[PDB]
Amino acid sequence: DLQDYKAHVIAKFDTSVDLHYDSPEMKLLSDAFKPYQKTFQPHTIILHGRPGVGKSALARSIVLGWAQGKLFQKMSFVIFFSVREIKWTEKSSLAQLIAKECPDSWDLVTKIMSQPERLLFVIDGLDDMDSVLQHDDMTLSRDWKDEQPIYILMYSLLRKALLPQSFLI
Amino acid sequence: SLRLRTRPWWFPIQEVSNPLVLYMEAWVAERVIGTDQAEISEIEWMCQALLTVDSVNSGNLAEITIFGQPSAQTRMKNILLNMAAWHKE
Amino acid sequence: DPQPVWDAEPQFCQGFLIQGLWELFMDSRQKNADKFLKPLSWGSEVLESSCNQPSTALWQLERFTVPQALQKVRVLKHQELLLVVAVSSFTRHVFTCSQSGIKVWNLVNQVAEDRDPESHLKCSVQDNKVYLRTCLLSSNSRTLFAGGYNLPGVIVWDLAAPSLYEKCQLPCEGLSCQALANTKENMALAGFTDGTVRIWDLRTQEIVRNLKGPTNSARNLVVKDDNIWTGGLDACLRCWDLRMAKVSLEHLFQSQIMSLAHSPTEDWLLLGLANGQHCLFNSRKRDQVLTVDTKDNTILGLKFSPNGKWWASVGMGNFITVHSMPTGAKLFQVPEVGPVRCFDMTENGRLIITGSRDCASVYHIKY
């Protein structure tokens, strides 16, 4: 079913061909999920810059390239949110929230068990998240598929609590 | 086009905003920097500034990028020019 | 029963315009001389003018200056009572840890009240219940130390790598840190609650020596080239030499010792008694002790100037007091809201910190 999802991902994004290439910028990003020194090895990676430049396009190319494969051998399946498209007022289960993005749901719940060994997770935005979010009261949920509000769920992945030994972009 | 470069946690986000690019002849510029990445990082920490050089144009001109506080940007430029002067002889 | 009332100290010009603009926005949708402070430029200097003097100094007397007042610039808010502060003028980072986490703040930011730290380095995740009370920062600002109560060791971090993480552990299973120290020869040592002073090799992470004495006798520790000074509830001062690793001096004092200090260039030593009595000692001559100042309240902290010409005092007397070196006379005072515990100073003698209950109040040294 993963091959079917990969083909579905391919059809979703075919806007530009110049952005998707095996540039040496790729081998830096692939080397980013590697220990710079033998003592310390990173897991969370932040790409920041001026809003106008193609940050979203760069993330889109990473999504498209994974369907072509060979982008990341330590890494199974991408989860793509765009916070501009969907509001965060309502509350729905994390498994339900990711069920809308991905075509199939029966494999998705079984996919979570295989996530910790090798994982991808991509975010766009959150600049409007922080201002809207009050941060006066906060909660942490340590289990998946729980019916929880999105921003408390979103806080959970970042702290590595809900996904131990995970990887971030 | 695009360009990527890692940013240390010690550096302030505000400091990253101003470039301090300096234009010097490419043969004079790339030779001073050196190929050893380890030596670059040691110089990077001592001055509390960021250094990144790229010579993509086929012409004999090269550009350098330095990031930091105005007092720190001065320190690296003076040393880099001094080493450039040394390479002449 | 005097009580201070706190006021918004900065009243910065930049914030005045922004605040005025907001109030007009809400007013429209309803039908349905002022004193400003100088901001800390780049987090390094204030760019002001010095004070006048009645006379001039010698040609050999130029860099030896003493302060005249202190001015508050920013307030840093932390959830729990902070117990230790650091300045690190090289990197402009202030360290204030307490409770489960360690909070690092950067001085580049320009804000009246600052609530978002650069990081929140927590310690309660490693094990269920461990409390910590102290930190130490290296002279080169490339290593951070922090000791606790039930920690299996002392935490060593790196400030030169591209990221922040843990490097060494320096185990101490059944001991409470309560004190730390470092020296030039690339190894460290700590003094626990039962007079346990032992030394680890910083690079190899191995124990090289162990020094044991009476319980509580190692509350205060001072390192030198080859000399180690201790002190505790026993009201006794002991000098240890690394070469043969045994006590060399012993002196009796009338009350408990609570603070220690050393001059950078001279050979003096400062002590703090439980009854507010200051004492001076010669590190080399070791002839006798002498007293200069007496205070009603106890003494909790003391520190010298970078040139070692003056010191400041902090205690539970609702005041902070500074004194000169030759005599110890009082110069000025600044009242606070609660009984202060900790303070620290820069390496270039420009700023100072002070924490009363839960928030650290950073002042500016006016020369």
CA distance B33 to chain A (A): 20
Interface with C, mutate which of B6, B9, B69 (most C CBs under 10 A) = B9
Cα torsion B79, B80, B86, B87 to 10°: value is: 160
Six token digits for residue A153: 């769920």
Per-residue burial over C103-128, b if 16 or more Cβ lie within 10 Å, else e, is bbbbbbebebebeebbeebebeeeee
Subunit partners of chain A (3 or more CB pairs within 8 A): B, C
8 Å CB contact between C170 and C200: yes
8 Å CB contact between A66 and A13: no
Q: Are strands C113-114 and C69-77 parallel, antiparallel or unpaired?
A: parallel
Partners of residue A59 in chain B, C-beta under 8 Å: none
Is the minimum CB–CB distance between B4 and chain A shorter than 8 Å?
yes
Method for structure elucidation: cryo-EM
Q: How many C-beta atoms lie closer than 10 Å to residue A166's C-beta?
A: 18
Q: Is the dihedral of CA A140, A146, A150, A156 positive or negative?
A: positive
Give me the amino acid identity at C195. Answer: G
Question: For residues A9 and A63, what is the distance between their CA atoms, to the nearest angstrom?
Answer: 8
Angle, CA C5 vertex, CA C305 and CA C338 arms, to 5°: 55
E strands, C202-305, in order: 206-212, 222-223, 227-231, 236-241, 246-252, 257-262, 268-273, 277-282, 290-294, 301-304
Six token digits for residue A151: 């921003």
Q: How far is CA C281 from CA A39, A148, C266, C284, C292, in A?
A: 45, 65, 11, 9, 12
Question: For residues B71 and C103, what is the distance between their CA atoms, to the nearest angstrom?
Answer: 27
Long-range contacts of B48-52 (CB under 8 A, 24+ apart): B48/B10, B48/B72, B48/C90, B48/C91, B49/B73, B49/B75, B49/B76, B50/B7, B50/B8, B50/B11, B50/B16, B51/B76, B52/B5
Give me the amino acid identity at A154. Answer: M
8 Å CB contact between B66 and B50: yes
Is the minimum CB–CB distance between A42 and chain C shorter than 8 Å?
yes
The gap between the terminal CA atoms of chain C, to the nearest Å, is 32
Partners of residue C163 in chain A, C-beta under 8 Å: 36, 40, 42
Question: For residues C120 and C104, what is the distance between their CA atoms, to the nearest angstrom?
Answer: 7
Question: For residues B63 and A129, what is the distance between their CA atoms, to the nearest angstrom?
Answer: 38
Partner A, chain C 158-177, Cβ-Cβ below 8 Å: 161-163, 165, 167
